[PDB]
Design an enzyme around this catalytic site. Structure first.
Site, PDB file in Angstrom:
ATOM      1  N   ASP D  42      16.524 -32.682   1.243  1.00  0.00           N
ATOM      2  CA  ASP D  42      17.966 -32.570   0.909  1.00  0.00           C
ATOM      3  C   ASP D  42      18.437 -31.322   0.057  1.00  0.00           C
ATOM      4  OD1 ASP D  42      20.284 -34.930  -0.863  1.00  0.00           O
ATOM      5  OD2 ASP D  42      20.581 -33.110   0.403  1.00  0.00           O
ATOM      6  N   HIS D  45      22.617 -29.968  -2.502  1.00  0.00           N
ATOM      7  CA  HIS D  45      23.133 -30.143  -3.952  1.00  0.00           C
ATOM      8  C   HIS D  45      23.622 -29.028  -4.313  1.00  0.00           C
ATOM      9  CE1 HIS D  45      21.615 -34.333  -4.779  1.00  0.00           C
ATOM     10  NE2 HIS D  45      20.690 -34.331  -3.954  1.00  0.00           N
ATOM     11  N   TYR D  90      18.491 -29.670  -9.727  1.00  0.00           N
ATOM     12  CA  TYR D  90      18.658 -29.284  -8.152  1.00  0.00           C
ATOM     13  C   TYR D  90      17.823 -28.074  -8.091  1.00  0.00           C
ATOM     14  CZ  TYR D  90      21.147 -33.607  -8.154  1.00  0.00           C
ATOM     15  OH  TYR D  90      21.597 -35.004  -8.267  1.00  0.00           O
ATOM     16  N   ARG D 162      21.573 -50.005  -6.889  1.00  0.00           N
ATOM     17  CA  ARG D 162      21.892 -49.278  -8.163  1.00  0.00           C
ATOM     18  C   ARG D 162      23.237 -48.839  -8.168  1.00  0.00           C
ATOM     19  NH1 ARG D 162      19.409 -43.236  -8.020  1.00  0.00           N
ATOM     20  NH2 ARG D 162      18.877 -43.015  -5.961  1.00  0.00           N
ATOM     21  N   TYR D 164      26.240 -45.762  -9.136  1.00  0.00           N
ATOM     22  CA  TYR D 164      26.673 -44.608  -9.717  1.00  0.00           C
ATOM     23  C   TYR D 164      27.561 -44.659 -10.501  1.00  0.00           C
ATOM     24  CZ  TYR D 164      22.496 -42.012  -7.157  1.00  0.00           C
ATOM     25  OH  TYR D 164      21.672 -41.604  -6.837  1.00  0.00           O
ATOM     26  N   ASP D 193      23.774 -45.310 -13.070  1.00  0.00           N
ATOM     27  CA  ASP D 193      23.508 -43.908 -12.950  1.00  0.00           C
ATOM     28  C   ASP D 193      24.782 -43.197 -13.489  1.00  0.00           C
ATOM     29  OD1 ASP D 193      22.675 -41.093 -12.594  1.00  0.00           O
ATOM     30  OD2 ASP D 193      20.855 -42.160 -11.283  1.00  0.00           O
ATOM     31  N   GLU D 221      20.344 -44.877 -16.216  1.00  0.00           N
ATOM     32  CA  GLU D 221      20.005 -43.717 -15.982  1.00  0.00           C
ATOM     33  C   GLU D 221      20.901 -42.296 -16.189  1.00  0.00           C
ATOM     34  OE1 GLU D 221      18.310 -42.337 -11.910  1.00  0.00           O
ATOM     35  OE2 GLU D 221      16.577 -43.441 -13.222  1.00  0.00           O
ATOM     36  N   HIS D 246      15.509 -38.461 -15.063  1.00  0.00           N
ATOM     37  CA  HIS D 246      14.577 -37.777 -13.969  1.00  0.00           C
ATOM     38  C   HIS D 246      13.737 -36.580 -14.538  1.00  0.00           C
ATOM     39  CE1 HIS D 246      16.586 -39.363 -10.732  1.00  0.00           C
ATOM     40  NE2 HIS D 246      17.761 -39.377 -11.225  1.00  0.00           N
ATOM     41  N   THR D 297      15.707 -38.385  -3.923  1.00  0.00           N
ATOM     42  CA  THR D 297      16.881 -37.352  -3.353  1.00  0.00           C
ATOM     43  C   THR D 297      17.420 -37.984  -2.306  1.00  0.00           C
ATOM     44  OG1 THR D 297      17.760 -35.150  -3.295  1.00  0.00           O
ATOM     45  CG2 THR D 297      15.660 -35.686  -2.204  1.00  0.00           C
TER      46      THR D 297
HETATM   47 MG   LIG Z   1      19.767 -35.907  -2.588  1.00  0.00          MG
END
Ligand SMILES: [Mg+2]
Ligand SMILES: [Mg+2]
Ligand SMILES: [Mg+2]
Ligand SMILES: [Mg+2]
EC number: 4.2.1.158
Lengths: 387, 387, 387, 387
Positions: D42, D45, D90, D162, D164, D193, D221, D246, D297
């Site tokens: 990924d 980002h 990222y 989960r 966001y 998150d 998170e 993270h 990710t």
């Molecule tokens: Mg990702």
């Protein structure tokens, strides 16, 4: 007056719970024929290895031979030099020093024809309130059985217990609920012991839900990992209930004091190295204006007698203590076990010289064990004292 | 075995320096006819007021009457309850508790026909190195005289001294210079005592210039105001030499430990309330892995004998101590004063029961004083012990 | 692929210094006939008691029997569960876990027909600079002899040494003076090791006078009591030289990192529980951007081979390490000892499967000892590794 | 055994949500013909720029050419030297190192004919519980649709999700309310998150209202801005629920540990640089006694296989993890995708050598994309992974 020989008698004595502990009864001989008896209590804790008693006898004799039993400071220094404090709760070297030091107290007291009590500062009280332990539930199916224990011991006089918690919060809560439910205020559970199984924030969440049941709760014990002084402090600031923790080394105790990490210092001879070391820890706690509770590893009558004398000499014990060994063990090694009446541990007769205890050779022979080797036991069983 | 009566004999005994101190010799009587003797040492310190001994006898009898002399923990608790710790170096209540507690040790030891030594943990050594004091110079003209003292005491066996400094850094430095100059390495001055006269940054500057002369310097004492734990810490971080301070209360000692404010804890029975309290402070220091030195207020042979026993029982004394009372006082109240040989204080004969000392009634009568009233003395003289 | 049996061979091997250490060579057998060999190095450290190997075999077999040798994470967890970390430098349980974990690495590597090196991340270098130890002087008369050692080992290729100091600063300084005096810059002493014998302010004074001699000094080791993280920090702030300390437990390492108490983390498999645990400590140090040195307890070729592989895989070792066991021990248990050339420990041939070592049964039998019982040894000798 | 060539295949694979991610499949060739495959997962980002793969191939070949694939420590050091850690979540350089390191693990494992599992420490478990993500709602009208997702995935076996949150607390709360409302305890949402979108005090207020709905909530998170260690700490002290964050760089992880800023360390290979770096972070967390969750990710089967092996080797994962890439992506590049059953990610067959995955050239060609250039996308869409 000088030490001439030493004897280490290993015994295996099962508990009513079925767990089998190994202890070592100590005998220190002198030139004038006077002998002191002591106890290296409960070697059955992790780590999973055992001490060679033949070797141990040589090492200790090497330290003690020819010494004047009255030089407790000197002798304890040499004991610590050969068995350094490790900052670990169950250091077998501590159990060892304990057996030597309490046998020396017995020896010295007998020599002066007085009770070990009069050699520790006297009496502040004649008995100390104690509690019977209910070992931790890992499954809900263990609850019913532990309820029978409560009902049964309560009938025998123990109205105060303590509960080991942390592995199955549902079962913990179930037990507590059932007790409150059946005995109301008749029974008290003076403390929930986590045995350092949880990180402090986890203990905080557990404490929060367990304290929904307050049956005369007096303290929360070991709610943080071993030596996590900062965790204890943060938790001490978040809980209204007092936080107690065991003293297993001077360095560790110094640190908990400097950080003001706890409210109650749980001091017990076996974990700190004996009566001499326990008095030091106790006095350090007094100097710091900290409360103290007499903890335990669950010892036989010889060891329990020793702690009883010490316990009745302390002025800063304002909560229920934990030594109930003789009630928990099916067997013992003395003619007459220390006495428990109405949930109180009685200090041995202040008129009887020494520990106020007498060994029963037949019992020694009966529970005699070749060594301190382990049996098939699991980590969980060792942590919970279950079988 | 129980206490039935108490006697307080006040005495006035001048020093070779001309300063006159008042002490109180204690006698605790029991039903079985056994009597313990003790000493409330040197009441001649600020504050400028005196305690009524007639009243004091009633108060103390009130606490002690009927008590078992062996209940030291219990009795000391009641003593503290009636004479609270004040966080002040010269709290007269501390001197009082000291005289009672050490007389109790004498009583108990005599009763068991043993030396107070065997009642304090035994012996680690048989004598402890001490130092003779050179009181502070306020004027350069006092130097010559103090040099005669050094020369004279050195000849008698004292090779180690200590110097009170802080009021006249020029005179301090002059003395030190003259000593180094005349005796070289023959004489040692183990510490410079500021008596809390300076704020820490001021002590730092003074320390910096005085330590130009290092004649076996072992420590800098009381280099900050009383109870300035933070000042002691900052200074402990800026000086290479160890920082020592007196322990005058448990709260104060707890705070110095938590802050790691000093290197050496100067513990002396008279300032902390007796042998029982001193052992507590000493053990607190041991638990904190801190060094200890046996301090002093300069006591008679009864008091010095007591501290001698305690001193020879401690394992964490690694520097020169200060009790030289009997050498400093022209008079004393015993048949045979404690002995000093080669700058060492000898622990009384371990064979002699009790303190190992004997009162001399003729001397008691000789130095007898009606009360503890003050004489014409100045603040400076009281702080410096000069006349 | 599964474990079926275990063997523990105890050996007694004296050093050229005369000190005699006991080790245990480990053999883990599998169903497919493949065997891994390991080493529980140097049990001859305080505390003064010994582990029963008959019992130990049952305990360990109990944990290992039937397990897949490749489940290192799983197995190490169970090992730690049965032998908890104690925050003590010489926890015998750590030596035990070490022997099991390194034998497992040997087993797994042999199974895949590769060097343990390729199982630890590969090579960053092929050899690591090490130093020969000069044990501490307690008396000036020991200097001459240690000078012969320097002269002799230097001739054999070791140009870097390390000195244990702290008990007699005069003798320490005398030795250093004599070395500089005779070899100039030919010899280097990469570190002065205090062995936690002094409180930090005392170490500071000692460091200050010893560092008058800088023969390529790389670090000051263990200049504070065990676990005195704050003392290490204060000292780290007062000394220009890097401060190194041993990692004996994860909790202890975590604390030194959080407090930024040291500059160099001395990591060695034997004290932390094996290669698996050492990698964890090493990686924790890398994540914290901290330097690392490969420490030692002085092990035989089996143990030294293991640490050699690990050492040559680390990227954050920028100083001289300490493993010189095979050079210090008069005997060993392999056909060909690990090789030292020009003060460098060579990683075993990367082509040889496993540890790159081979046991010599005749040597095992030769140095065979019945158990790990102690011999007449003093505390000082145990701390200094002298005879 | 040495690396001779490298291949970077860029692919564009849309998700069922419509968001299109670009990945790069890696191939490392050796002289002996063995090839390792990896995944730089990924790249879609922020920041809004793309890496030139033609240039990247030269740079990486430059580092890797001729190296022994087993020198993971050495190679990872060079990778970090060329792609420094940036303290940013990222950093595309991290994705790059990840693809190289995991391809190297595949290569080494294939070479030894073993599963990458046996090259990471073995197995502690065979599968790990994971959760399906419900991307954040910016409008109430997005709720209904996400409810269909829950209902649908629940039916397929995922009982844990989960959410966001943070941009529209009303819509967040609406969704949670609707879920509880419709599924009761059938579905769990293990974490909310915030994606570092809120300052800590704002997160605190949001947490306070969102946690009115506790459907098996396990953690909160990223409730603070990126790298706001102090904010995480304050929040960790105010919330009962565990705080997870993270790990995107060693420096950042070191700081969160020193400050004890969080409860759970969310570690995922792609954000820290690969399996080698993830193990380092994981071990650092173990040494600090901190909990760990396997983050994500959202990667293809090659990357998911890698993390699966690592995940089943960790002993400190006690919560639900996040890798569900193959379930989220409409396409993939392997013959058989990793398997999910009952909300569990299964570790690839331990018998299959390497990653236990096989590339499907037809799929590579199918999803082949010329480069990693961006498409018309908004900041909000990039943060929320929406279309
Ligand atoms: Mg990702
Ligand atoms: Mg026990
Ligand atoms: Mg005075
Ligand atoms: Mg060693």
């Amino acid at each position: 007056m000088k030490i001439t020989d030493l004897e280490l008698h290993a015994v295996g004595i099962p508990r009513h719970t079925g767990f089998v502990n190994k202890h070592v009864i100590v005998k220190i001989h002198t030139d004038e024929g006077l002998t002191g008896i002591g106890e290296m209590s409960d070697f059955s804790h992790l780590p999973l290895y055992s001490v060679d008693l033949h070797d141990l006898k040589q090492g200790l004799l090497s330290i003690l031979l020819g010494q004047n039993p009255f030089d407790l400071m000197k002798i304890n220094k040499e004991l610590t030099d050969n068995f350094p404090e490790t900052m670990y709760y169950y250091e077998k070297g501590s159990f060892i020093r304990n057996g030597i030091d309490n046998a020396l107290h017995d020896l010295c007291a007998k020599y002066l024809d007085i009770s070990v009590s009069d050699f520790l500062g006297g009496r502040v009280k004649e008995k100390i309130k104690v509690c019977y332990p209910i070992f931790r539930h890992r499954f809900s199916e263990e609850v019913e059985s532990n309820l029978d224990v409560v009902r049964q011991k309560l009938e025998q006089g123990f109205d105060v217990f303590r509960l080991y918690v942390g592995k199955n919060l549902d079962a913990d809560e179930e037990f507590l609920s059932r007790v409150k439910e059946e005995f109301g205020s008749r029974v008290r559970i003076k403390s929930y012991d986590f045995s350092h199984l949880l990180n402090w924030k986890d203990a905080h969440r557990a404490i929060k839900r367990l304290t929904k049941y307050d049956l005369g709760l007096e303290m929360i014990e070991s709610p943080a990992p071993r030596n996590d002084f900062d965790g204890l402090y943060q938790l001490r600031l978040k809980t209204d209930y007092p936080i107690s923790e065991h003293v297993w080394s001077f360095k560790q105790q110094q640190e908990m004091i400097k950080k003001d990490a706890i409210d109650i210092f749980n001091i017990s001879p076996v974990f700190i190295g004996g009566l001499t070391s326990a008095k030091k820890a106790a006095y350090a706690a007094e100097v710091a204006s900290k409360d103290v509770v007499l903890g335990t590893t669950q010892e036989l009558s010889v060891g329990t007698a020793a702690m009883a004398h010490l316990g009745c000499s302390l002025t800063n014990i304002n909560h229920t203590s934990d030594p109930t060994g003789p009630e928990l063990y099916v067997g013992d090694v003395v003619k007459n076990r220390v006495t428990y009446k109405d949930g109180y541990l009685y200090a041995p007769d202040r008129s009887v010289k020494g520990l106020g205890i007498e060994l029963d050779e037949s019992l020694l022979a009966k529970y005699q064990v070749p060594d301190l080797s382990w049996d098939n036991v699991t980590v969980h069983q060792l942590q919970d004292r279950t079988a």
